[PDB]
RNA sequence: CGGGAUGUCACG
DNA sequence: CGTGACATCCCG
RNA sequence: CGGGAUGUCACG
DNA sequence: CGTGACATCCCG
């Protein structure tokens, strides 16, 4: 192959798409859009429990990404968009290093403010909730810039770029969920693929509304998820063997109020929570009350 | 090590960005846009000569591309865009197999009809012209989807997708040119990078108007070109060492008329080629007349 | 050179 | 329906 | 849980 | 102008 040797004289162009691995999540970086292409993580009940704190971590450029192709906090702040992490920080309570690697900008995309801490947040919580029914949960997340047909019939992909480095703002976010009940069972695996628009949503629509077939998502994203997964074998819809239903307004508001006290140093903060709970029309469940009287010390 | 085996248990997702080598070019395919991301080729005096013929070739899907992520002629035909090859067929006249592999849709992007046959064609000509003065030249070509600033300040990337498979139509096309004078000399290498918009362009714009720096291109494209090339050494702007001058209207149409002499199958057809030249206020060069007189006499015998 | 419109025969 | 190879013609 | 606005000290 | 680790305060 002498002809091939001259062709490679100076080397092929580099795309920087090789898989980058961290202490509890891997990803492939898109050097052109300056966002991750896909982010893989494994969740177990053992991992979502720990002492790693979320406010001792800062969003910073991944020092493994060439600064030329890296994004920076200056691109997000005040751009009208938020820094949305794909590998959730909450999935790494067990390790402080793992949680800190979640805050590398290689793992975050521009995300609607309401969608981030709202609907998408609830999807991230449901993933952690599956750990109580499945010993192993694999999740794959990433951005999407999807087309949209217009009056004259033709389809146009259109997406915003923000900051000096032009970080691509996706029109949708995808999340594939693969769950197996036990390490020693051979139940069919539970699989679910979902595509959510990058915008405020609310509580009306059920997560089933956003479900799509795996092979479809693979077509719109140009990826092949879980190659080693024997597709000839029997695989079942995650939503037929589970709930696929996020927290309602009352549950979500209470969960936040329950977790807000854990970081409430002062007694004044606890007062506001109740005043806000009363302003919310909710009826404080006894669980929150048990975690209310213990922290009044 | 064990907390990783559980991650890889079902494997990482596949991107399909690995290089795919062929007879005279390589490329990395973009499975999401159904177009090549970059296409690398090497050309020389010997490779741009031969008996390989376009008209005995066909556009069709690269068989090494999963049909799921592949483009098909149905996506292009009737979409309002042409099939533009990044690795030119004219750069592989020496091998019938090599030329055939440039018609794989893995080497094709939706390209404006006028652009494909006009300005971009003339750029591919200038690359073949460099083989007269450089023994080896490398070319990287691919598509781009660049942003645009609205009046209100927002920057928007927009591009049409065509066909059922949503093949992306780039806003611009890029080309990186690297030429070394000789394998035994150590004259500084010459490099030029260019970004042309995917629309009709005439004969007034000079190639240097679309020239950019290698850094600027790598930032736009998210690629790094020619990694093993030492960037601290002495590298020259190709448009200073060479001409970066595309053919004007007269010599461009003249070149086409000469290439059409070979395909002339009747004396009357061959004379029509010359009448069109004269109607265009172009006087053929002595090379055309020799070629014209030759093909003429060749066609008179068997008639 | 770069793109297109067509026909015919053979065979899966 | 597709696969090949031979051919005719058009445009810039 | 998920995102933002501010401070004091320390070092390069 | 860049790296680490303390702190209080807003919002859904
Ligand atoms: Cl067409
Ligand atoms: Mg988030
Ligand atoms: Mg072309």
For CA atoms A164, A166, A171, A173, give the dihedral sign: negative
Q: Residue-wise over B137-174: b if at least 16 C-beta within 10 A, else e?
A: bbbbbbbbbbbeeeeeeebebebbbbbebbbbbbbbbb
The DSSP code for A119 is: I
Q: Which residues contact A283 (CB under 8 A, 6 or more apart)?
A: none
Q: Please indicate if any CB of chain B lies within 8 Å of the CB of A94.
A: no
Q: By three-state DSSP, how is residue A137 classified? A: strand
Q: Identify which of B35, B40, B36 has the alpha carbon closest to the alpha carbon of residue B25.
A: B40
Whether the CB of A76 is less than 7 Å away from nucleic strand E comes out as: yes
Contact B69, B159 (CB under 8 A): no
Calpha distance B278→B299 (Å, rounded): 22
Q: Identify which of A258, A256, A249, A252 has the alpha carbon closest to the alpha carbon of residue A293.
A: A258
CB spacing of A16 vs B222 below 8 angstroms: yes
Calpha distance B123→A68 (Å, rounded): 29
Calpha distance A127→A133 (Å, rounded): 11
CA A159-A165-A169 angle, 5° bins: 25
Contact B224, B142 (CB under 8 A): no
Q: Which residues contact B179 (CB under 8 A, 6 or more apart)?
A: B130, B134, B136, B137, B138, B189, B190, B191, B238, B242
Q: Identify which of A42, A50, A49 has the alpha carbon closest to the alpha carbon of residue A183.
A: A42
Q: Residue-wise over B77-97: b if at least 16 C-beta within 10 A, else e?
A: eebebbbbbbbbbbbbbbbee
A-chain residues near B15 (CB < 8 A): 17, 28, 37-38, 222-223
Q: Tell me the technique behind this structure.
A: X-ray
Query: For residue B214, how many C-alpha atoms fall within 13 Å in the half-sphere facing its CB?
Result: 18
Calpha distance A193→A87 (Å, rounded): 16
A-chain residues near B140 (CB < 8 A): 13
What is each CA distance from A137 to A171, A192, A274, in whole angstroms? 26, 11, 35
For CA atoms A253, A254, A255, A257, give the dihedral sign: positive
Mutation target vs B (from A2, A15, A216; most B CBs, 10 A cutoff): A15
Calpha distance B17→B28 (Å, rounded): 5
Calpha distance B89→B93 (Å, rounded): 7
Checking DSSP bridges between strand B167-168 and strand B147-149, what pairing results, if any?
unpaired
Backbone angles phi, psi at B245, to 5 degrees: -115, 115
Q: Please indicate if any CB of chain A lies within 8 Å of the CB of B5.
A: no
Q: By three-state DSSP, how is residue B156 classified? A: strand
| Helices B249-263, B267-279: crossing angle, 10 deg rounding | 180
- Residue A220 burial (CB < 10 Å; 0-12/13-18/19+)? middle
End-to-end CA distance of chain A: 77
**Nearest-ligand number for the alpha carbon of A89:** 2
Resolution, Å (one decimal) = 2.8
CA A116-A119-A120 angle, 5° bins: 50
State CA A143 to chain mean position distance: 10
Calpha distance A216→A176 (Å, rounded): 12
What is each CA distance from A9 to A208, B136, B228, B229, in whole angstroms? 52, 11, 8, 9
Which single residue is written with the structure tokens 């300056």?
A34
B-chain residues near A226 (CB < 8 A): 10-11, 13
Calpha distance A243→A137 (Å, rounded): 15
Domain boundaries of chain B, sorted by first residue = 20-252
Q: Where do runs of H (alpha helix) occur along B59-155? A: 73-76, 96-101, 113-117, 119-130
CB spacing of B228 vs A147 below 8 angstroms: no
Calpha distance B225→B140 (Å, rounded): 8
Calpha distance A98→A24 (Å, rounded): 6
Backbone angles phi, psi at B75, to 5 degrees: -70, -35
Q: Which residues contact A268 (CB under 8 A, 6 or more apart)?
A: none
Cα B83 to ligand 3 centroid, rounded to whole Å: 7
Q: Which residues contact B69 (CB under 8 A, 6 or more apart)?
A: A219, A222, B16, B29, B31, B32, B34
Taking a contact as any Cβ pair under 8 Å apart, which residues of chain A between 177 and 206 contact chain B?
A: 178
Calpha distance B146→A161 (Å, rounded): 10
Q: What is the distance in angstroms between the Cα of A156 and the nearest Cα belonging to chain B?
A: 4
């Amino acid at each position: 192959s002498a002809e091939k040797a001259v062709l490679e004289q100076f080397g092929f162009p580099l795309t920087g798409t090789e898989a980058r691995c961290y202490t509890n999540h891997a990803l492939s970086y898109d050097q052109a859009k300056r966002v991750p292409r896909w982010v893989l993580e494994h969740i177990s009940k053992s991992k979502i429990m720990g002492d790693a704190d979320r406010k001792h971590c800062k969003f910073k450029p991944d020092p493994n990404i060439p600064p030329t192709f890296s994004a920076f906090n200056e691109d997000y702040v005040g751009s009208g968009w938020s820094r949305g992490a794909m590998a959730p920080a909450g999935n790494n309570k067990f390790s402080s290093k793992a949680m800190a690697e979640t805050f590398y900008l290689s793992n975050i995309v521009p995300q609607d403010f309401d969608n981030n801490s709202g609907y998408w947040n609830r999807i991230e919580m449901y993933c952690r909730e599956l750990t109580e029914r499945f010993e192993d949960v694999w999740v794959v997340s990433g951005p999407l810039t999807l087309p949209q047909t217009r009056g004259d019939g033709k389809k146009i992909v259109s997406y915003q770029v923000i900051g000096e480095d032009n970080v691509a703002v996706p029109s949708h976010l995808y999340k594939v969920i693969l769950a197996r009940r036990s390490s020693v069972s051979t139940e069919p695996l539970a699989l679910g693929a979902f595509v959510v628009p990058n915008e405020a949503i609310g509580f009306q629509p059920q997560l089933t509304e956003f479900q799509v077939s795996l092979q479809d998502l693979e077509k719109l994203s140009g990826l092949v998820f879980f190659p080693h997964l024997d597709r000839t074998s029997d695989i079942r819809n995650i939503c037929s063997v589970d709930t696929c239903k996020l927290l309602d307004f009352q549950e979500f508001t209470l969960y936040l109020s329950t977790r807000k006290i854990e970081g409430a140093r002062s007694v004044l903060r606890l007062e506001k929570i109740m005043e806000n709970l009363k302003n919310a029309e909710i009826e404080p469940d006894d669980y929150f009350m048990s975690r209310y009287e213990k922290k009044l010390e």
